[PDB]
């Protein structure tokens, strides 16, 4: 019954642009942050580890310093959105979205990057 979903399971983006990939999860009325965990991963790197209302930057891979953000206001709407700025060719590959809010689930997303 608790299910993480993906509007798009595939993204195709231009080199150098911005991108926001989305994982959705069910929220009824108001969202309690204490109960909520969000992970975004890419390959063996950690992009986002959101626990206790806070992103944990000491666990974050340094490749992603300055360019990666979980969009906080989108969370109330049951949408774990990951904004990555200045997209490079190395950003291409399979991403993972884990969300725990009572129950827990995860999904994968593929990002493809065209060069010019």
């Amino acid at each position, epitope marked *: 019954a608790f299910t993480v979903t993906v509007p798009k*399971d595939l993204y195709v983006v231009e080199y150098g642009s911005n991108m926001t990939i989305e994982c959705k999860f069910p929220v009824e009325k108001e969202l309690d942050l204490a109960a909520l965990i969000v992970y975004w*991963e890419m390959e063996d790197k950690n992009i986002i580890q959101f626990v206790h209302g806070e992103e944990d930057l000491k666990v974050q891979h340094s490749s992603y310093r300055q360019r990666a953000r979980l969009l906080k206001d989108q969370l109330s709407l049951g949408n774990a959105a990951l904004q990555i700025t200045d997209v490079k060719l190395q950003d291409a590959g*399979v991403y*993972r979205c884990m969300i725990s809010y009572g129950g827990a689930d995860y999904k994968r997303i593929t990002v493809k990057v065209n060069a010019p």
Partner: antibody, heavy 121, light 108 residues
Framework: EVQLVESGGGLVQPGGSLRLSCAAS????????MSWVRQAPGKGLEWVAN????????YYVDSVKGRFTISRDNAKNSLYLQMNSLRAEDTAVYYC??????????????WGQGTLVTVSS | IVLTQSPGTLSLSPGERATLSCRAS???????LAWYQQKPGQAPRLLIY???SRATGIPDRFSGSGSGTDFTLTISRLEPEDFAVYYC?????????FGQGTKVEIKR
């Protein structure tokens, strides 16, 4: 030369407990998601449990949730299934499988040969 | 997510082409659909992943296609070694699930 070897199976009476183990070789075990899959005699294949590289996340089928516990030791190159409160429908060959790629996107890459678990009075 | 394989049994001569169906009750995310081969007394071998890619060392008479909820596995020009039970499996969405299998039997 990826290798997978299960151990620990046998006979156990209903309501009893048993611990399966799986040894890995030929690949970096700490880099991969690992699964258990079972098969009852004459039936088809059923996925059972899942564990993340660091043991930080675990998922189960409905039928074993609350009864089976999956766990792993990356140092020992080994995977474990602690089965408790066993019913007769848990009787099956139990396989360990590597989930290939980073997050399992290469499906079940490689399998052990399986070990038979028999649950009966 | 329920996978319904079809048909139950195929009776074919070596050299014939085999077509196996897998239908899903839901869309399979990213087309993460695997196929497997099992011979009696052995563990399954991976054939196809991501619906259309061959696993390593799998010969090219094994070919996958489909997308969404409808998936096909084709074995063109069957060899004697290809007669076995075939399984499809979805790994796009938890819980991972398997179809009930298809047996490809030598017709003599």
């Amino acid at each position: 030369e990826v290798q997978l070897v299960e151990s620990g199976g046998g006979l156990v009476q209903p309501g009893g407990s048993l611990r399966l183990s799986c040894a890995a070789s030929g690949f970096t075990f700490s880099r991969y998601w690992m699964s258990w899959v079972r098969q009852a005699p004459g039936k088809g294949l059923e996925w059972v449990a899942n564990i993340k590289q660091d043991g930080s996340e675990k998922y189960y089928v409905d039928s074993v949730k609350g009864r089976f516990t999956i766990s792993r030791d990356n140092a020992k190159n080994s995977l474990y299934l602690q089965m408790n409160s066993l019913r007769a429908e848990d009787t099956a060959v139990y396989y360990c499988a590597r989930e290939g790629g980073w997050f399992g996107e290469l499906a079940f890459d490689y399998w052990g040969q399986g070990t038979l678990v028999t649950v009966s009075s | 997510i329920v996978l319904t394989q079809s048909p139950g049994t195929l009776s074919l001569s070596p050299g014939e082409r085999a077509t196996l169906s897998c239908r899903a009750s839901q869309r399979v995310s990213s087309s993460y659909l695997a196929w497997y081969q099992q011979k009696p007394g052995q563990a399954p071998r991976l054939l196809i992943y991501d619906a259309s890619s061959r696993a390593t060392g799998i010969p090219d008479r094994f070919s996958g296609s489909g997308s969404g909820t409808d998936f096909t596995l084709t074995i063109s020009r069957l060899e004697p070694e290809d007669f076995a039970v075939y399984y499809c499996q979805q790994y796009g969405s938890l819980p991972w699930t398997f179809g009930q299998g298809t047996k490809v039997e030598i017709k003599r």
